[PDB]
Structure 1
C-alpha cells in the first residue's frame, strides 16, 4: 500500500513539471522575440496559456484528492475546481479547431488569405472562443443546474468531505457535444480537404518534372489527428455511456480515462512548435 503512494506521487510531480515547463518556454519564446509575433502564433499563444492554467490548477489538486482519498477543503472550492477543470478542458480544443480552420483558409484560399485574417479579427475570435467556453463551465456549476437527483449524489452533496462528479443526462450530453463532438467533424473535413490539396499538387509536380527526379503529408496529418483522438476519445464516450444507463462503468475506469485525457497537455508544444524558427528561439535563450 505504501509503495503505491510513493510511486503514484513521483508520476504526478513529473507530469506537472513537464506540463508547466513547456508551456512557460513557449509563452516566453513567443513574447520575447518580435519575429514570432504573427497572426497564426496568437492561437498557439492562447492554447499554451489555457494549457498552462489547466496543468497548474487542476492536476495537483486532483492528485492530492486521489492520494489522500479525502477532500479536506470546503464545498465551494470543490465547485470552483470542477468549474475550472471543465472550462480549461473545453477551451483547450476549440483553439485546435480554430487552428485547423486557419490552415484550411491559408491553403485553399491563397489569394484572399491576407485580407481575410487580420490582427484585429484574431483577438475577436479568441475572445469569442473563451467566452463560449466559460459560458458552459461556470454558469451551470456555480448555479446548480448540473446537480443530480438520486440518493447517492445527494448524500455526497450534503457531506463536506467528498468531492465527486455526479451529473444529469442533459448536462452530460450537452457539455460533451459542445466540447468534443462538434469540433471533431470540422477538423476531419478540413484535414481531408488539405490532404486532397497536397495530393493534387504533388501529382502536378510529378507530371511536370518527374522524369528528371505522399509519405510526408500522412506522417503529419496522422500524428496531429492521432495524438488528439487517442488522448480525448474514450473519455468522451464513457461520459455518455455511464449516464445513459447506470451500473456499466466503474469509477476507477472513469478516473483513469479522465487522467489519460490530461496527459495531452505535454504534447502540444511538441506538435505545434516544431518549426526551425522556434528551435532557433529556444537555442537563443536558456541554452
Structure 2
C-alpha cells in the first residue's frame, strides 16, 4: 500500500470521523437541550444521530485499518461480525431517513388524523421497528471481504436501499406537488417557492448521490457485471461520507435547530 499517501488517507478519514461524531452529538444535545424541540418527531433524528455516531466511531477504524494496513489484522473471529454490524448500522441510518420522510408525508397529508396519532409511544414503536428490521436484514452474513452470495447480496441491497429510496422519492415528490399547488406578498410567495424547491432538491439529491453509486455498483458486481474497479472504494467511501452530512441536511433548514446550534456555539 502507499507509504506517505497512507498518512494522507488516514489523516483524511480521521477528519471524516471527527466531523461526523461532532455534528451528530451536537444534534443529540440541541435536541435534548432545546425546549422547542420537545416534539415526538425528533426522536427519529436522535436515533439517526446515535446510529451514525456508532457507525463512525467503531466501523470506520476497522475499514480505515483495512485498505490502509492493506489486510485484516484483527481476529478472523471478527470479520463475520464486523461486516454484519457495518451493514446493520448503515441500513438503520437509511431506514431512519425513510421513516422520517414517511412521517413528514403523513403529517402534511391527513394532518389532523396523524397529529391525533403522533404519540411518542408510536414514535418509539417506529424506532424499534426500524432497528429490528435493520437487525433482521443484517442477521444473515490475513484478509476479510464482504459477502458474495448472489441471491443474498441482491436481496439485501434491494430491500435495504432501493425500497427506501423509492419511498423517499415518492413522498418528497408528493410534498413538492402539494407545496407548488398551494404556492399560488407575491414576491415572498415566489421566494418561498424557490426556497422549498431548494431545501427538497438538496435532501433528495445528497442521499441519492452518496448511496446510489455504491449500491448500483454493488449489485453490478453481484449480478456479474462487476465493472467497478477501485472506483467501488471511492463509491464505498462516498457512503460513509454521506453520514457526516446527513445531520446537516435534516437540521440546518429548521430555525428552531439553527438557533439552538447558534446558542450552543456561542
Question: What TM-score does the superposition give when structure 1 sets the normalisation length?
Answer: 0.85
Distance 1:31 1:67 in 2: 37
What is the CA-CA distance between 1:70 and the residue it aligns to?
Answer: 2.3
Distance 1:263 1:77 in 2: 24
What is the CA-CA distance between 1:186 and the residue it aligns to?
Answer: 1.4
What is the CA-CA distance between 1:67 and the residue it aligns to?
Answer: 1.1
Structure 1 equivalent of residue 239 of structure 2:
261
Structure 1 equivalent of residue 40 of structure 2:
39
Out of 191, 194, 213, the position equivalent to 1:234 is 213
Distance 2:120 2:51 in 1: 20
Question: Is the 8 Å Cα contact of residues 217 and 226 (structure 2) preserved in structure 1?
Answer: no
Structure whose alpha-carbon radius of gyration is higher: 1
Structure 1 equivalent of residue 144 of structure 2:
163
Runs of at least 4 residues off by over 6 Å: none
Question: Is the 8 Å Cα contact of residues 97 and 183 (structure 1) preserved in structure 2?
Answer: yes
Question: What TM-score does the superposition give when structure 2 sets the normalisation length?
Answer: 0.92
Structure 1 equivalent of residue 157 of structure 2:
176
Judge which range, 224-233 or 264-273, deviates more. 264-273
Structure 1 equivalent of residue 77 of structure 2:
76
Aligned length in residues:
260
TM-align CA RMSD: 1.9
Question: Is the 8 Å Cα contact of residues 147 and 153 (structure 2) preserved in structure 1?
Answer: no
Question: Is the 8 Å Cα contact of residues 108 and 197 (structure 1) preserved in structure 2?
Answer: no
Aligned residue for 2:72, secondary structure, equals: coil
Structure 2 equivalent of residue 282 of structure 1:
261
In the alignment, does 2:92 pair up with 1:113? Answer: no
Aligned residue for 1:233, secondary structure, equals: helix
Aligned residue for 1:35, secondary structure, equals: helix
Distance 1:113 1:14 in 2: 41
Task: Note the 1:236-251 alignment, pairs <5 A.
Answer: 236-245=215-224, 248-250=227-229
In the alignment, does 2:177 pair up with 1:221? Answer: no
Distance 1:191 1:285 in 2: 31
What is the CA-CA distance between 1:34 and the residue it aligns to?
Answer: 3.4
Structure 1: gaps of 5 or more residues: 142-160
Structure 1 equivalent of residue 22 of structure 2:
21
